Structure 1
């Protein structure tokens, strides 16, 4: 019901009051569809670096893991629900950024060269969205305290500003950098799980937030485990797709068609 009599109205400001809040509309329409026993076997992989650049990217992720695992106390304590959600909550705020700068820079190339994209731009922009929905789900489990709330703001500034020039300078490095970051998302999200399953972790959020059920389409009775599993799936998807793009780049196949448009 979107035709000219609507299109000719100047503003719809008076309709903000009457329209509802529906969890459904937080996301774009591009929802992940996983079936749990299938993705139940997603498993940790490690792609060989090739040049300097991969090796460079690869040190960057490992130099960063070793910082972040000490400063976030993560090791010195028996694992809990709490210290995990804080880890991820924090981790997903950078997980937004490259997904975005990604398309936003590919997008401006397309507009300025007057050329095709062949379906990269929307693939990335949803990698940005999915990583933001992770965050909108984790926020529901725990609001962070002023400490973290602040460190996010600095981090983001720093990260944004690395990632935009690292893209302009070397897309191959960034896709490669990200690919390596997700091998670590997969590692951890399987730890978390091994933990639940053995019992070393006992979860109290067996409710799964409204946003999280609709986004992922889960059962009304989906567990804390269930939710990690799909997030763990989502993290594997991105692992491939970037290491893919980095290879693609590596071989000057970076105006080729994005293979994953087909591969649905």
Structure 2
């Protein structure tokens, strides 16, 4: 019931106290739809860099991972649920920046040039949302201290600034950078799953949060392992989508149809 009578009211501020906080409202209705036994065989891939921009994007991603794993100490001592959840918590904050700056920029460009966007913007905005829901999930499993909360704030200031100027200069670099980020994300999350299957990691967070159970349409029997599986699948999708988008830029197809709008 949304008609002229509601459109003619000044404010619905009076209604806020009587509307429930439902977990399904945290996202849009564009939810991933994975089948566990299929996404089980998501694999680790690597796209060869074409030239200088692609090499720059990859060297910057690899430099970032080597810094990050060494400073965060992921490498030494055994894997644990605590360092896994902690790691992902941090990185998922950054993860939702690229698609939002990308979509914002293609949006602005569509408006100032009065051009069609042909399905790109929505794909990058939903990507951004997807990563944000990754974050919403992990913060149900672990609430960070002040040091990590302060680091997250300053890391956002830097990555937003970087991603914004980089996308204005070279959308190709950004899409490729993201592509390469998701290559590493798929590696990390398959390391998580492998350590679970090998008993090196005995996860205890096996009451998958409600936010995630409705977002990924997971049953109440889904476990931590299943949740990481669907997150990893999401990452692989971003991996392909972004390398594809970078390729299109490389070929001067940035004003062509988003091929994923149909492949749907």
Could you list the per-position Cα deviations for residues 210-263 of structure 1 after superposition, in whole angstroms to 9, with x for gaps in the alignment?
000000000111011000000010000000000000000000001000000000
Shift of 1:116: 0.3
Could you list the per-position Cα deviations for residues 146-204 of structure 1 after superposition, in whole angstroms to 9, with x for gaps in the alignment?
11000000000000000000000000000000000000010010000000001000011
CA distance in 2, matches of 1:175, 1:222: 33
CA distance in 2, matches of 1:10, 1:254: 42
Shift of 1:75: 1.0
Secondary structure, counterpart of 1:203 in structure 2 = coil
Secondary structure, counterpart of 1:178 in structure 2 = helix
Secondary structure, counterpart of 2:134 in structure 1 = helix
Shift of 1:28: 0.6
Shift of 1:65: 0.4
Secondary structure, counterpart of 2:118 in structure 1 = coil
CA distance in 1, matches of 2:3, 2:65: 53
Structure 2 unpaired stretches of 5+: none
CA distance in 2, matches of 1:181, 1:25: 28
Could you list the per-position Cα deviations for residues 40-60 of structure 1 after superposition, in whole angstroms to 9, with x for gaps in the alignment?
100000000011000000100
CA distance in 1, matches of 2:176, 2:139: 28
Secondary structure, counterpart of 2:18 in structure 1 = coil
CA distance in 2, matches of 1:98, 1:78: 31
CA distance in 2, matches of 1:225, 1:234: 15
Which residue is 1:198 aligned to?
Answer: 198
Secondary structure, counterpart of 1:2 in structure 2 = coil
Relative to the length of structure 1, the TM-score reads 1.00
How many pairs are equivalent? Answer: 264
CA distance in 2, matches of 1:109, 1:71: 39
Which residue is 1:170 aligned to?
Answer: 170
Which residue is 1:185 aligned to?
Answer: 185
Secondary structure, counterpart of 2:17 in structure 1 = coil
CA distance in 1, matches of 2:160, 2:213: 30
2:54 equivalent to 1:74: no
For 1:128-167, what aligned pairs fall within 5 Å after superposition? 128-167=128-167
CA distance in 1, matches of 2:141, 2:259: 36
CA distance in 2, matches of 1:35, 1:120: 25
Secondary structure, counterpart of 2:215 in structure 1 = helix
Could you list the per-position Cα deviations for residues 108-128 of structure 1 after superposition, in whole angstroms to 9, with x for gaps in the alignment?
000000110000000000110
Could you list the per-position Cα deviations for residues 20-78 of structure 1 after superposition, in whole angstroms to 9, with x for gaps in the alignment?
00000000110000000000100000000011000000100000000000110111211
CA distance in 1, matches of 2:29, 2:158: 31
CA distance in 1, matches of 2:42, 2:96: 22
CA RMSD of aligned residues (A): 0.4
CA distance in 2, matches of 1:76, 1:144: 21
